[PDB]
């Protein structure tokens, strides 16, 4: 059991849950690979994961080993012998979706993990039904700006059948257009999906903030291109409380972060289409999406407008510009009554989550590199907290792109 | 070999040097412990370490497999067989100290690793001569503000005789006076060594920036107290370029960071006293030392004087105050003409180092959590660089406090 210390307070805890880690991460005693974004890369096997998820579920509701427990087990045995897969009960699916959030080591927002709206789309067929399940997700989750966590679970993977996939990495993304001068107009992260929407017959725009269509894929069919109703996509134009020229930069961002390209794994079952959404932490927008050199890369533009000395690094013009962009994000979302959390509040809440989980299950998988915010690292309490990273199931996992 | 990606550029390398990692770290495939501050804690083993180190030395001078190379291997073999230990040649000690720096995964300053002044103190015989070696180090390294990197190597550990030790964690450190109610006047990080100085006869001040004496330990002797000559301890009064009241906070910091409590390991030999010094990166002073809640903890005081809304996190008052403190540190050192580097220049030079080392050795041991600075993380290039962490020798190691 690894000993983990908080260096600001001096307290000591032991992570006993890590002993239960299901799958293997990339690290070995010879070398640590914790900084890598991708830690890389049947029926008797499926049953072993299915059984242990069922034992988890019944333990969580006290029905440990009771009458319903053994019958659920024998039910799954027969289903897999008959079909090669099995179906989850609706409560097992809700439980599994929440635990997979709960287990996500890179999520700072997990204090909220017990509050998630699960929409069961497992009866889905055709891309037009996908699109309708999706549009209902967006409307429920946006809630006119009072954002609410939700996940929509499309049908699981099963043998011989194609897959339900959402090709977009998020439900709301801005286009990125390659151009003759080499660079990109819009979001460079989305250059690949933007030329795929264009390939599949989408006439493009020419703005830096053109909302992309959806490329939805039903099993064993090409993807179909749907346009989101513009009144369903809530956006926040960015202004600054005191810098009147900030608004003239024409920056904006969207209200709803809805990740649509990860795979949900519950009890050996795999759901390659299960978009989930919550709300944003301010640094995600104002530091990473707007100030990453390979994203909108606006930081020098703001610094020029602030009349900072951009010819020496030691003036900290980069630091001052980033702070005001983050201020603009917080101010604009609050003025628009869209849910947003600043990085100080979020990390403080994650510390409370760590304490809750220490008592609930003896530890908490956490990825320090991703929990610590991308600005003001050591000004937040998570910087001073040692963390243990490991993989538990149910889980959210990366998956190959469909194409 | 592990594949390593830079996400700003897209470039990919493979760290083939990690396959040579001798000593094991704390991670397993089950769980990564990369965020822990302390990752750890006879003839034929000594020989294999000595042989490896000699091989390194002769590769470094492009004379591998030469007559000199084979003869030095045999010579080390004969001395170990006769005495159980051996002595480094002078040239080997210089090379080994530079390689220990080169190998230190938590150091962002390693672009400089070849420029290191190595003072050989292995004939030192008393605490009094120890103090003279230390004063000569400080005088050379300080160089009236034009800082020069240096290390002084005291005698190696050997059987049947105590170690040389410097009890202080750095050669220059401010007193921390622990108060009855748990508060501290001075630097809270130095409360232990402050109480040991007093217990060993030092008459304490009552300031916040009182320079501590040195407790110097010769073999098999209690530590002895030595006062540093005030004229050898260069200090920088802190002022801000545009906030004139900042000067009235009465803050100061010292010019020379000189770590004195780590163990230097070279070719299986151990040097428990081997102080080394370079110059500061400004975030060490302005962010960690002055703004850590468990250090000087000045953030709220500064934010109040700047008239910031400290009642709500979403004002980003902490971020704004931390930036101006960091500006004051850089401005103040530049005004005093004392060497300092800001976190942007330092991290840019570290990216150059990684490219150099990829060519030279096929990889570079790097601790992401320590290389990324404590403010403005994703605004520096190292945030977006995947890193592999591992232990090479020669090495600087932690060791228990001698009391
Ligand atoms: C309720 C508000 C939420 C906030 C403020 C929040 C915050 C965050 C942040 C800042 C990250 C780091 C993402 C990045 O830097 O790219 C993250 C990661 C993650 N979150 Fe949360 N999150 C929330 C809700 C949710 C929900 C509802 C789920 C799923 C049910 C979830 C699952 C995940 C996963 C799987 C990751 C890791 C993604 C990856 O590894 O790429 N989060 N979260
Ligand atoms: C020349 C300018 C240098 C700069 C700007 C620099 C910078 C740094 C910084 C910022 C750290 C992190 C320290 C902390 O957070 O406590 C570090 C760690 C370290 N530095 Fe450097 N350094 C320099 C020179 C040197 C030299 C000359 C040596 C040894 C000969 C050295 C050896 C180390 C080691 C071993 C560590 C790891 C300390 C630990 O693990 O606690 N550095 N350095
Ligand atoms: N895509 C590539 N790299 C890449 C890899 C990983 C990433 C990180 C993507 N995380 C997006 C994300 C995930 C989780 C939470 C949020 N934020 C939230 N607050 C919420 C979202 N939902 C409910 S809350 C955002 C980005 C890019 C490529 C590599 N090669 C060609 S493309
Ligand atoms: N305090 C404890 N732990 C503790 C453990 C580790 C640490 C980290 C200590 N880094 C000090 C340091 C190291 C390397 C470089 C610099 N900076 C420079 N620029 C240079 C210095 N030389 C040439 S360049 C500063 C600090 C505290 C305790 C344990 N038990 C009771 S207290
Ligand atoms: C190389 C490194 O793992 C990569 O840049 C990580 C670091 N930490 C992160 N932290 C968050 N929150 N989001 C990220 O995308 C990343 N990227
Ligand atoms: C818990 C965590 O490892 C600890 O706070 C580390 C994080 N990164 C660091 N990085 C540097 N450069 N110096 C430090 O002291 C630390 N502290
Ligand atoms: Ca100007
Ligand atoms: Ca000899
Ligand atoms: Cl995003
Ligand atoms: Cl220091
Ligand atoms: Gd102007
Ligand atoms: Gd002024
Ligand atoms: Zn690891």
From Swiss-Prot, chains A, B:
This is Nitric oxide synthase 3. Platelets, placenta, liver and kidney. It comes from the Eukaryota. Changing residue 397 to C: Found in a colorectal cancer sample; somatic mutation. The chain holds residues 68 to 480 of 1203 of the full protein. Heme b binds at residues 107, 398. L-arginine binds at residues 170, 279-280, 284, 289. Zn(2+) binds at residues 27, 32. Transmembrane segments: none annotated. Homodimer. Interacts with NOSIP and NOSTRIN. Interacts with HSP90AB1. Forms a complex with ASL, ASS1 and SLC7A1; the complex regulates cell-autonomous L-arginine synthesis and citrulline recycling while channeling extracellular L-arginine to nitric oxide synthesis pathway. It comes from Homo sapiens (Human). Produces nitric oxide (NO) which is implicated in vascular smooth muscle relaxation through a cGMP-mediated signal transduction pathway. NO mediates vascular endothelial growth factor (VEGF)-induced angiogenesis in coronary vessels and promotes blood clotting through the activation of platelets.
